[PDB]
Every structure is written in C-alpha cells, then in structure tokens.
Write a protein that binds this ligand. Sequence first.
Ligand SMILES: [Cl-]
Ligand SMILES: [Cl-]
Ligand SMILES: [Cl-]
Ligand SMILES: [Cl-]
Ligand SMILES: [Mn+2]
Ligand SMILES: [Mn+2]
Ligand SMILES: [Mn+2]
Ligand SMILES: [Mn+2]
Ligand SMILES: [Mn+2]
Ligand SMILES: [Mn+2]
Ligand SMILES: [Mn+2]
Ligand SMILES: [Mn+2]
Ligand SMILES: [Mn+2]
Ligand SMILES: [Mn+2]
Ligand SMILES: [Mn+2]
Ligand SMILES: [Mn+2]
Ligand SMILES: [Mn+2]
Ligand SMILES: [Mn+2]
Lengths: 102, 102, 135, 135, 122, 122, 128, 128
Amino acid sequence: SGRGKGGKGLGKGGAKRHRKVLRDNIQGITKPAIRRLARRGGVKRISGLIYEETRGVLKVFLENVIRDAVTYTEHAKRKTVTAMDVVYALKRQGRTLYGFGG
Amino acid sequence: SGRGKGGKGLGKGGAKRHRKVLRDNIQGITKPAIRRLARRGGVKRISGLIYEETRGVLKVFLENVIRDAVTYTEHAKRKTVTAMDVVYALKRQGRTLYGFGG
Amino acid sequence: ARTKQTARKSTGGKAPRKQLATKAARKSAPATGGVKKPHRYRPGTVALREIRRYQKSTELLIRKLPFQRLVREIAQDFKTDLRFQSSAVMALQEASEAYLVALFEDTNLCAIHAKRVTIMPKDIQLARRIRGERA
Amino acid sequence: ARTKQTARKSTGGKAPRKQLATKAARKSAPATGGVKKPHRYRPGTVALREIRRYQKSTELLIRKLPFQRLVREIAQDFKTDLRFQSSAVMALQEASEAYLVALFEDTNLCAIHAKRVTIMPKDIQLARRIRGERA
Amino acid sequence: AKSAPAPKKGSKKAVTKTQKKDGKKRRKTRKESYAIYVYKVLKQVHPDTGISSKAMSIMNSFVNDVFERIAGEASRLAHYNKRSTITSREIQTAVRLLLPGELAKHAVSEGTKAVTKYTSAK
Amino acid sequence: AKSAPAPKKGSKKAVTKTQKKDGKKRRKTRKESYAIYVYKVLKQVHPDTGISSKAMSIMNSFVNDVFERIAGEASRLAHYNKRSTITSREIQTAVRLLLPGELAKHAVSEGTKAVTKYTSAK
Amino acid sequence: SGRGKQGGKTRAKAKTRSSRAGLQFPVGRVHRLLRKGNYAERVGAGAPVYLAAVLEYLTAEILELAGNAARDNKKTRIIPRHLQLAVRNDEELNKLLGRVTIAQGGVLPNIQSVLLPKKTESSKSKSK
Amino acid sequence: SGRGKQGGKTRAKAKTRSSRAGLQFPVGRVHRLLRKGNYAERVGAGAPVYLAAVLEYLTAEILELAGNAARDNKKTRIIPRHLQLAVRNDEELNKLLGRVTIAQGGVLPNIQSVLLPKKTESSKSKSK
DNA sequence: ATCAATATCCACCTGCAGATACTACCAAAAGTGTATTTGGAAACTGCTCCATCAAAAGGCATGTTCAGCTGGAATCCAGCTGAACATGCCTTTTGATGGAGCAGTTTCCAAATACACTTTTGGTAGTATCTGCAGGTGGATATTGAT
DNA sequence: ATCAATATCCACCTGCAGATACTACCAAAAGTGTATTTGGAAACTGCTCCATCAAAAGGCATGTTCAGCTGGATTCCAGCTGAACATGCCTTTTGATGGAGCAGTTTCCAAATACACTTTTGGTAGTATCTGCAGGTGGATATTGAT
Ligand SMILES: [Cl-]
Ligand SMILES: [Cl-]
Ligand SMILES: [Cl-]
Ligand SMILES: [Cl-]
Ligand SMILES: [Mn+2]
Ligand SMILES: [Mn+2]
Ligand SMILES: [Mn+2]
Ligand SMILES: [Mn+2]
Ligand SMILES: [Mn+2]
Ligand SMILES: [Mn+2]
Ligand SMILES: [Mn+2]
Ligand SMILES: [Mn+2]
Ligand SMILES: [Mn+2]
Ligand SMILES: [Mn+2]
Ligand SMILES: [Mn+2]
Ligand SMILES: [Mn+2]
Ligand SMILES: [Mn+2]
Ligand SMILES: [Mn+2]
C-alpha cells in the first residue's frame, strides 16, 4: 500500500510482478474487425491482400501518434501517458479529437 | 463580306478585336496555358473537357485565397492588396509560399 | 372418319400435344428436377446488410484488449516502462478507427473509379498518396 | 573513271540552273499541291517532349495580363476599388500555378489508376475529393 | 468575520483531525468547463431535451477548440499589424476568416450586438 | 537687398543642419531579415557560391517559417504544462516533435552544443 | 474625483459583464482565458464580449441541430451520435469541423450507388 | 588589480551572445523575437541560443544541398530552382517543407513509366 | 406471380448506469473603485509605386485538317472472395487489492524581469565597379520514324 | 538495316540585369551593471487510478466448404485528341507621367493596466433518489430469393 521499490518502474521480489513479452499484437487487428471497419466505410467487397495492408497502415498511424504522445509524456517528466498527451498529439497531426478533454 | 470558313483571306474565322472590359477573363486562362500546366504536372494526354474543369477549379482556388487576402487588407484599413496579405492568406489555407516576405 | 365407333381420334388421343409443364422443383419432390434447397442470400446481400448495420451504429469495431496490447507493444518499442491512463488508450482507439473508416471511404472511391466494387491494396495506396500521407 | 555522271557543278543549290529562270525551288514542291509524305512525329512524342521541357523550367505558364485581370475581377467581388502591389499578383500566380501543377500530378495518378493515359474531369474530381477539397 | 491573509490557501485534509462529515480530500485543483453554459443554451433551444456527459464532453471540446482557433487567428492578425492589443475588431476579423459563410455572418451580428449592448451600460 | 545666396536647382538651407534624425532616418523604418546571417553560413559551407536575391528571399521565408513553427510548438508545450517560461528544454522537445528523424537528431546536437559552449563562456 | 469616499451602487456590483452584454456565456472567464493564453500583450474590454457571444451563438447552432437529430431518432437525450449527425448533415458546421473527430459519433449512412443490387441480377441471356 | 565584480573596464559590448555560443545566427535578435512573439510570459536565456543554433543548422543543411545542386547544373550562384531541387530530392527536407511552395522552384523531372513510348515500359538506364 | 426462409419492425417491458437533486464549503473568480500610463486613431503629407497611356513588335492563341491510337464496349471464364456452418477460445465482465506515481502544499534561490546607461550594429542610401550566365551562333550527333 | 528530318547538346562569346565593394549615417539593437521579483524544482506525501489477479461464459474468431459473379484478359473499332499549319489577335515591353495611398511623424485622449477591497460563484464533495433507454421478448410485417 505504498511499499516496494520502483526506480526502474515497478517490482517486488517474492514473485509478484508481471509483464510478459509483447509481440505480434498487430495480428490482434483481425480480418473480421477490418471487414467491420471497411463496412462502416461503405465497402462491399474486399480483396484478400487488404487485411495485411490495413495492419501496415494502422501500425504507421499508431506509431506516429504514440511517438508524439510519449514525447509530450516525457517532456512533462511523467511515466504515464495521459488522454491529454494523446489529444495534443492528435491535434498536432491535424487529427483533432473531441471527447477526451482539452 | 463573309468569305472563307477557315484559311487565308480576311474576315474568316478567328477575327475578334477588343480587349476585355467584360469578356474572357476566366476564359482568358487559355487551353494552351492549361496544357502547359498539365505538362509540368507530367500529363501526356488531355480530355477536351479538362479545360473548363480546370478553369472552375482555378476560380475556386483564387476566390478562396483572395477572399482572405482582402480580409487582411480591410482589417489593415488599406485600399491596396499587398504581397503579405496574400502570403498570410495562403499560409492559413495550408499553402505556405516562400519568396514574397520582403 | 372410319364410320365406326371408338372415340379415339383427336381429344388427347391421336398423339401428344398435352402433358405439359415442368416436372419437379417445388419443395423437394426427389424425382429429379431442381437440385436441393438450403437457404442462401446472394453474394453481396449480407455485405450490404452489414454496411447498413455498421453505418447506423457507433460502437468501436476492433476488440478492446487486442487493441490495447498493440498500443502497449508499439509504445514499449519507443520507451520502456510506460503506463497508460485507460482513457488514453480509448482516445487512441477512437482516433484510429475514425482514421481507418475514413480511409476505407476514400479507398472505396478509388476502387469505384477503376470500375471495381472490390477494394485492393493499390486503392489504399492511391488514397494515401493523394492525401499526402505517402507522396 | 570519268568526270561525268555528276558534272554537278561545284556549288549552288539553285534548281533553275545555268539557263534562265530563277525560282525558289530546291528539293520539295516548286509547284502547288502535294508534298510526298511530310514529316510527322507520332501522337504522344511531342506531348512527352513538352513534359520534359516544362519539368525542366520554372517560368510561370499562364500569361501575366490575363491572370492579373482574373485576379482583379475576383477581388472586386469582395471589395471594390482595390489596388494590388505587383508582387501580390505575382504571389497569387506562383501559388495558383503550383497548386494546379500538383493537382495535375494527382489527377494523372487517378487516370492511370483507371488504366487510362488521358486525364478526365472525373480524375480531377476524385483527386479533389480525396484531398478534402470537395469532401 | 475574517478569512485572509494566509496560510491555508489550498487547505483541506492535513494528516487527519476532523470534526464531523467526511469530505474534501486535500482540495483538488478546479477543472473548469463550459458545461453549465452549454446547458443553459440547450434549455433555451430545446427546453425538454437533455444531454449525456459524453456529449457534454464533446461540446466542451468544441467550445475550447473554437475559442483557441479564433484567439490564435486574432493574435496573428494583431501581430501582422504590429498591434499589441486584441480588440473586438481583431475578434471580428478572425471570425470572418475562420467561419464559413452564413455562420460567420450570424456570428458577427451576435458579437456586434453584444459589444454594442455592453458599451451601452453605465 | 539679397544676392541670391543659393541658386534655383532644388531647395535652400534651413538655418542650421541636423547631425541626426532628419539626416536619414525617416523612411528608415528598419525592415530586418536573416539575409546577412544566411550569407555567412553559405560562405562556411560553399565559399565560392553565391545566392540570388530571389533565392535569399526564399531562405529568409524559410528561417522565419521554422522559427514560427518551433516557437509555436514551444509555446503550446509550456502552456500544456502550466509553465510561463519557454526554456531550451521546450525548444528541444518542440524540435523533436517538428523535425523528421535525422534532421531532429542533428538539430538537437547543434542546439545542445551551442548552449553548452555559451554556458562555459565568460 | 479624488479618492476620498464613495456611496451607492447603481452600476452593478451584482451585475456580471455577461448580463451587461446580454449573454449566457461567461465574459469574465473568456477575458481571463484570453489573457492567460498569451495571444497579445493587451486584451480590450470588448474582445471577450464579442468572443463569448460568438461561442454562445455556435453552441446554440449545434445544439439546435443536435436536439433535432435526437428527436428524429426518438430520443430526448443528446448523445455524441446526435452531435455527429448534426454536424455532418450541415454544410457549414461540417466544414468548420472538417478535421475534427467526434468520439462515438459514427458516420452518416451512405452507400455508393454502384454498390446496390439490380437488373434483377440475371445476366442478359438468362444466366449469371 | 582588484576592483571587484569585474563591472568596470571593457564596459562595452564585450562579446555578442552569438559569439559566446559559437554561432553565426543572431542570438539577441532571436531572444527579442521570442519575447515579442507572445509565445510565453518569460523566455529563458538558453532558449534563444538553442533555437538560433537550430535555425543556423537547418540553413546550413539546405544551403549545402542547394549549392551541390547549383554545382550539378554548372552554376556558381544558387537560385530558387536549386533550393527546390535540394529540398525535393531530400526525403527529410521534403517532409519538413511538405506543405511549402518555393516560388520559381519548378518541379522534379518525373514521368510516369506507363506514359513512356511503346505501350508501357519504363526502360531507361541513364538516370533510371 | 406463388411460396418460403429470414430479416426487420415495433410495441411492451424491466433493470440500472448514468443522470439528477439538495446541502455544504471555499479559494479562486469577478466585480467596483481610483489612480496612472499609454496604444494607436486622427490629421497632415512626403514619396513610393501603382494605374493608364502610348504603340510598336511578334510571340502565341485559335481554327482547321487528318488519322493514329486510345477509350471503352462486348465476351469469355478461372478462381477469388462472400455466405453459411461447426467448433471452441479468449475477450469481456465483475469484483478486488497493492502500490506506482500523479499532484497538492510550503520552502527557497537560481535565474528572469525591470532599468539606467554605454556601446555596437544592421539597415538605409549614395555612388560605382564588377561578373555569372542568359541568350545567340556553329556545328556535331542523338532521336525519331518512314522505308 | 538504311537514312532523311529534326531535335538536342556542347563549346564559345558577350551584353547586362543584378550582384558586389566602399563609404557615410543613425536609430535602435544589444550588452553590461545592480537591484528586486519570482517561477518552479526539491522534498514530502495525500490520494487517485493503473496494473494485475480471478473466475466464469458466451460473443465472436477461426478454419473450412462451396460456388456466384467479379476481375482480368482479349478483341474490335468509332471517334477523340494530338500534330502540323496558316492566320493574325492581343499580350508584352518600356518609356514615362499623374497621383493614390502607403507609410513616417506629431498630438493627444479614450481605454488599458496596475492595485486594493469586497462580494459572488463554479467546482468539488457527500448523499440519495429519480429517469431514459438499452437490451430482451414475442408476434407481425417486409425482404430476399427459388421456382
Ligand atoms: Cl493491389
Ligand atoms: Cl469525366
Ligand atoms: Cl475591445
Ligand atoms: Cl533556458
Ligand atoms: Mn518490443
Ligand atoms: Mn504613445
Ligand atoms: Mn479510323
Ligand atoms: Mn486500350
Ligand atoms: Mn510513491
Ligand atoms: Mn555595419
Ligand atoms: Mn545558355
Ligand atoms: Mn512562487
Ligand atoms: Mn477456434
Ligand atoms: Mn465456377
Ligand atoms: Mn466484370
Ligand atoms: Mn493623397
Ligand atoms: Mn453555486
Ligand atoms: Mn431497443
């Protein structure tokens, strides 16, 4: 309840701190999910190569916004990315978002 | 004297003689100038309907930029549109132009 | 005639000209004449039904946890040891989905421009290039 | 082994030759009618030559006076009796031409996307919609 | 009787010591919003219509975004003209630059009407 | 009773002269630019290369543009963090947000170098 | 006149600049925000009045249209969806908010014509 | 030989801030412009130095590339065309100036392959 | 056109997350009063540069002829991609707990603002010399396209 | 393959728009000295909410089958658009005069800022209780698709 260590982040000792390696999570953006986004976009038929192409485009989109959001986070000396860090990052990339503050 | 139908002689097709004061103007942006613009843009073949389309687009662009430039002119209480008024108008429309800030 | 008595000639007799119509394909009547029956909507009908459904709703379309792991993975590659407000992740998801949906709208316009109804990678590529995201 | 055959004097491109007559004949059509297959570049060869010429230069491509007139006319709709600094008009022309040239590049990509080499109004329209100018 | 001077400024919750009623955990810094004003306007236009908190968060973003866009445009206008004061005149021109046709027209009318009224008092 | 102390080829003298103001400061509304500094840098990178006036104006616009973008980004950064001061740290972070990869690394390296030198400077 | 002392209250005391300008939005707050944002060294008295009036006006416009969308969808409470329908179906607000995303707004129903079925979908010579 | 604080001799503008920073760009002017730009209430001393250094560095990067372009075109004087060539052929400068128009800059030579002679076949080996 | 398989519509209903309602407190927000400072509007006008002529001189737009080759209509068909289905897993949901770390509160000085004063400098102006390269001429040779 | 008809390029030459070198002048740009103010980092810690665990279960993902109909390839040819010409309209230039009005300067006052008080108010917090509508059911009506 306020005891531990920190420094490098978090941790315990008597076997208690998680965080497994994160990899290949872009595959979590599934074919059904992309089909649903395309449907809301008014798309009726989709070529098989669209799914990997869409993952690639989303990865670039996310890398760009997250890069700026984390830059705001670090400049503020924080270790937690805030909704505001994301809103400002979105705004500076010309993707203004309403609903999350600011 | 009617004469001809296109070729030699005098009075034959292609014989106008005035200079504006309500005439061409947008029609003054010629098919040849538009073709040249397209060539610099890498275009090899042009539909006959492109010329009027281009005039329409160019008029919208100028209306937009000139409207804002004149808004800056009036705010300044001036009667003369300056290069800066145009530079500021272009910048706010996302079309920053370098070379005219003297 | 033949002046006798039979009542054969003509009236359906003589030869055929009557014993009409199709033979099968009503509900089943397995005698052969109309294949089987299981109900199927035609290709495209359900796709159109899904467009109407999803354009009427607003819920996020990517699963939440999988999207959250992608965000964490990418962020982690930029800077280790980050934590996220949960609304920061929802903000990224709202923005990401609106971005993709709008891009699919432009991509569809590109497929249609080429006389197709099927979007392909080149349509996405053309839309991103005209947008200035690529070239 | 001779000197004959030619005996084609030493110089002189004159056709009438060494005896009266002095027309402008040389090696074409001193008469009045045909020609014998004049020279013609194929459709597309000169268009390609123009693309290379204009992509190498930077001079404005729309005539100055007709452009100035258009600008003044448009401005008169927002405020009458305005004057323009000469560089204001030039700034507008530099910006307008750069805008149109870049739009033609996009329009060209749209034509090619549809398997054409000829740009059409629908290509300009698609490009402007994707850019968010129409949209 | 008397509040000032100091200290305390930014009180609430110091160690413990409490009389009655459990509240005010070390005063949160106030986060202002346009919500009560947005709500006031909503009732004028649609008396029996409510608004969800998410829609209200959207309205708050909208008002803050337009405020920043108009103020930024006014700022630039003032600097371009070497003026150190943003007056209603810079706001008006920023409005004409930022808003599309009919909206700018009605916005300019309301802004002008408000300044004229404001200056008609006292 | 005069002998025409001065002919008629312009204007005459007004008693005494001026060793300042009227000298030549009127239409002297100073209009500064980065031209002489851009010129100095061109010499360090290309000693035998010149630059046309039109090109120099492009450069002046360039420096002014980047200054505004970096300063504007630094401004928002400080405001977002509730800081009334723009320090080298805000300039650095603004540079990282505005400039593409390699350009940012070298810009940051140059900025950090100038501030260090400047610091360890008399 | 010369410091001294004063008495009586007619100007206001309890009269906000908002009431004085005939507004619902807060003139005092807008004035403070204009000063806090570093837009200029000085802010005239009329600037926050004009700006508050404009913000109030735009708010009324979006709420009018959004309440209409909620009514059209048989709802009495405005949610993000209604704001998005109001904005995207209005030419001018759509342009003002052209690069803005309203969270949980969805999109306008819109299927391109060429994608709808037809011709009874039966070849030309009775086939596929 | 004593005095104290050094606030005496050479009371003149000893060294400019730019000189102390090892810069060619005007630190004092950059300081003044930051202050008059209304970017923030206060401006720290190192901010105009860091910024002047970045402005000088970027200027050097573009002049280096435009000078190379002038040189490749057999010229010793940089004109707008050379700045355009320099920026557009540089991936990062091109992106930084992605929404900027260099007057009298022209465009980069570029013909879509499908438009080249003989149906469609890029070919070329000179610059391709 | 009839019939059937399903989707879709709507009335009716209930649970409940979110919305909404009073009581309580207060630190910042906001208004009123006086005094003091000053940004910039108003009037005058100097001189920069914008508008109009004048008026040849010919670069370039426009109209015409001809047909090459492009756009797009019409056909065929391999196989991609949508629809439907079985299976079962992993996202979602509901509830909990430690503790990282964001953020409130007071202290305290390095560094910024505020000023007076001295010095330095970039910009404006003349007047004057210098020079990179555009534009022109030869003539070579590369390209294009018919035979 | 041969070779004419043109386009295109390189080497050189020179006038001149435009860059450059030198001197003169000055307001303001900039730096230095000293005296005061203060933003915001430290340090300490209240208090939020982030990471993570648990367990259950059903919405939804996955993987497969089957074949409808789409995209891709091919062929054909009407007719649009490019290339080449013949005119001759009208932009371009340049030379040079009015005078509009931008822009420099001096006044001067309406309104801004600074400062000290006092009242007002929006936001935050604790508690409780409504209320709009999601989500579900059940039957009626509509849509789609086979014949
Ligand atoms: Cl593809
Ligand atoms: Cl078309
Ligand atoms: Cl005002
Ligand atoms: Cl600093
Ligand atoms: Mn990783
Ligand atoms: Mn003054
Ligand atoms: Mn034919
Ligand atoms: Mn073809
Ligand atoms: Mn801790
Ligand atoms: Mn000097
Ligand atoms: Mn040359
Ligand atoms: Mn303090
Ligand atoms: Mn499975
Ligand atoms: Mn088949
Ligand atoms: Mn097809
Ligand atoms: Mn006058
Ligand atoms: Mn209250
Ligand atoms: Mn329901």
